[PDB]
Amino acid sequence: HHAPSYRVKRMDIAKNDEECVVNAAAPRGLPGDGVCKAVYKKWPESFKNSATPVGTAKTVMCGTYPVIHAVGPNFSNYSESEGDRELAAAYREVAKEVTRLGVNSVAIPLLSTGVYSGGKDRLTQSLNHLFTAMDSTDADVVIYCRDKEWEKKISEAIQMRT
Ligand SMILES: Nc1ncnc2c1ncn2[C@@H]1O[C@H](COP(=O)(O)OP(=O)(O)OC[C@H]2O[C@@H](O)[C@H](O)[C@@H]2O)[C@@H](O)[C@H]1O
């Protein structure tokens, strides 16, 4: 009867202490410069056939460690309304994969808030879609970020719901 939790840590997600990781991935499965740079350095084997459409997630094992490649929309290319829909959908697929995998915990970044943000601050938009998808799972969720002001805002959002 474990109590599922949310936490946020400001550090490289490749150093996570959870049972699986979510990559903020690209649709063609190519290595990138954000989270995906770290994921490719740490779990390169998980990039075999990791390509998957925008708005979806695809899990590839590195050994027995699952890497869930979730592809948020690039808001430079999508309208605000369609990009919002694809971002929500990518997180829904993450929740389904976390559940299917049976893991007790997952390390997760904020999708579409960096390289794919279209130059806008999307912390709240992305975090709220994360909660909408993950709230109904019972895995411990650890959100990884790099910006010190974002850490505070994410922490505040978590705490105000408890
Ligand atoms: N190693 C990291 N650990 C934790 N957070 C990180 C890390 N690297 C970046 N971040 C932060 O994670 C959030 C998501 O940013 P991106 O990784 O750039 O993801 P996204 O906006 O979804 O862009 C995906 C695209 O970037 C490429 O890396 C990827 O291959 C894809 O083409 C941002 O707030 C970013 O500052």
From Swiss-Prot:
Changing residue 12 to A: Partial loss of ADP-ribose 1'' phosphate phosphatase activity. Phosphorylated by host on serines and threonines. Changing residue 116 to V/W: Almost complete loss of mono-ADP-ribosylhydrolase activity. It comes from the Viruses. It is found in: Host cytoplasmic vesicle membrane. In the N-terminus, the macro domain displays a mono-ADP-ribosylhydrolase activity. The central part called, the alphavirus unique domain (AUD) has a zinc-binding function. The C-terminus region, also called hypervariable domain (HVD), is mainly disordered and binds several host proteins. This intrinsically disordered domain contains 2 SH3 domain-binding sites and 2 FGDF motifs necessary and sufficient for the formation of nsP3/G3BP complexes. Seems to be essential for minus-strand RNAs and subgenomic 26S mRNAs synthesis. Displays mono-ADP-ribosylhydrolase activity. ADP-ribosylation is a post-translational modification that controls various processes of the host cell and the virus probably needs to revert it for optimal viral replication. Binds proteins of G3BP family and sequesters them into the viral RNA replication complexes thereby inhibiting the formation of host stress granules on viral mRNAs. This is Non-structural protein 3. It comes from Chikungunya virus (strain S27-African prototype) (CHIKV). The chain holds residues 1334 to 1493 of 2474 of the full protein.
